[PDB]
Design a protein around this ligand. Sequence first.
Ligand SMILES: O=C(O)c1cc2ccccc2o1
Ligand SMILES: O=C(O)c1cc2ccccc2o1
Lengths: 282, 273
Amino acid sequence: PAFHPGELNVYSAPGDVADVSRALRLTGRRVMLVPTMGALHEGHLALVRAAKRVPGSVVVVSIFVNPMQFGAGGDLDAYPRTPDDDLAQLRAEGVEIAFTPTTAAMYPDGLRTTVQPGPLAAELEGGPRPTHFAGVLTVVLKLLQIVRPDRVFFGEKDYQQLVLIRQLVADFNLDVAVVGVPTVREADGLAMSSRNRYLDPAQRAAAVALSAALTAAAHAATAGAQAALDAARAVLDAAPGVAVDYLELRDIGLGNGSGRLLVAARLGTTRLLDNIAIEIGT
Amino acid sequence: AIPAFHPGELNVYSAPGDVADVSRALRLTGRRVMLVPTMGALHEGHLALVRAAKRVPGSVVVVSIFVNPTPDDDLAQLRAEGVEIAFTPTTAAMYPDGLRTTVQPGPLAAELEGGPRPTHFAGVLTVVLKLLQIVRPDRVFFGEKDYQQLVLIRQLVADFNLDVAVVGVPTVREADGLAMSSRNRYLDPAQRAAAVALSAALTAAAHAATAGAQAALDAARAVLDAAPGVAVDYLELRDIGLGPMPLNGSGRLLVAARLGTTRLLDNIAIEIG
Ligand SMILES: O=C(O)c1cc2ccccc2o1
Ligand SMILES: O=C(O)c1cc2ccccc2o1
């Protein structure tokens, strides 16, 4: 396949992106990978920019709505799809490679060999959806194998995901560095997500409570962990038809001092996640 | 700041990161890295794998030895085969975080070998994935003796999009056809005499196969039937990927049996018609 530099090159075949990737690496360029599910927004763009700023980089953005991380009924047919836009944003960012595989090319033998996560996959987000992270890690492994990048980028918004990815990478000895990138927020603090378009004016207004509780907790934390949790709790209780799924304070690896506070809540049918770093006593 | 590597010599590394560094540096200088994963206690069967890997123009041979949960003799054979890298890591080096993320095999891992040991191949594929990631060879060598295993590794490679050729090396046998294995040494003399029936039965079957699949199966069974003290766990004809037997065409006939406490396996290629 052709590679036209300083331009967006779009490959659909794993073979084609694998060949270009390998060729670019043998020419000294450093391969950056940003796995996305499309519907790009400014949170994905921060990920591209981090990769862009790595000296000698050639950036691969992949776009694949992976039917293995979704479960019935349900969420798969409803995922936002906007490839036109996505590709334009990527041209505008000066990304050179977009990898957009077909389901058939990724799953020619269906679900056969898969990745089985550690017990962290059974908690938090994986509580209701116990096969969700196995689907995520399977496609992430396939993607790293196809593209073999130097580094791979993930937002901290999906913190649990990032942690399991660091697990996949360590546990399977993958020669790739995992770059966590801080969450991009709207001007009021709402963590940017494509699930956000599904909020109406009211819920969009109520939605600010997640970030506010979290940031309230981050500051109340000098008074310790009960104080941080109770502060976030209070903010969430004062917010109209925000229904809290969970609100949990964990170690940063997700097992006082330094931790991570995590929230999941529904607004109508729209499930939102957010998290923040927490220093207990600091 | 790469670890020390002396060409034409046996270099031993126990650190994953060391063998990863050497291997990467060697490929840049135009050697082709060949991996031969072993579990130690090398016999001729392992040596046939090593020899295949040496055949490749440009090869540097990496032999891992690791027991998945003979030290000086094994290395002496490797030095004697002219192998240049052994990878002899600890359990803690390979599993510093315990069993956390693992490989889940497809349904074939539940059959055959299979039913007695339901989690065996999960262990196998996981460790093999890791060796592949550590060493990143161009080619990886497995004996056909453990044929279900080879099939499942080929599935790993395909399914996870791994950049490596799987090379399957024919079974080394003793003079009477008994598939070589470190277990063979446990057999008393009666058992060792009766153990010839597994290969005997498989080669009878392979030759009976001009008459079709039932004649092959029946010739194999007659031969096992004529052996005392041989408990047959399965005798099965499958296609070459271990799916069900197609009506004509290439297949594989596999057998497992228990002789006292010692469990023996064998397998053969079959052409129906
Ligand atoms: O668009 C995203 O937020 C995204 C996509 C994606 C693909 C595989 C694993 C994790 C992922 O996060
Ligand atoms: O000694 C062997 O035949 C052997 C070694 C090995 C290592 C990983 C997976 C399977 C394996 O078989």
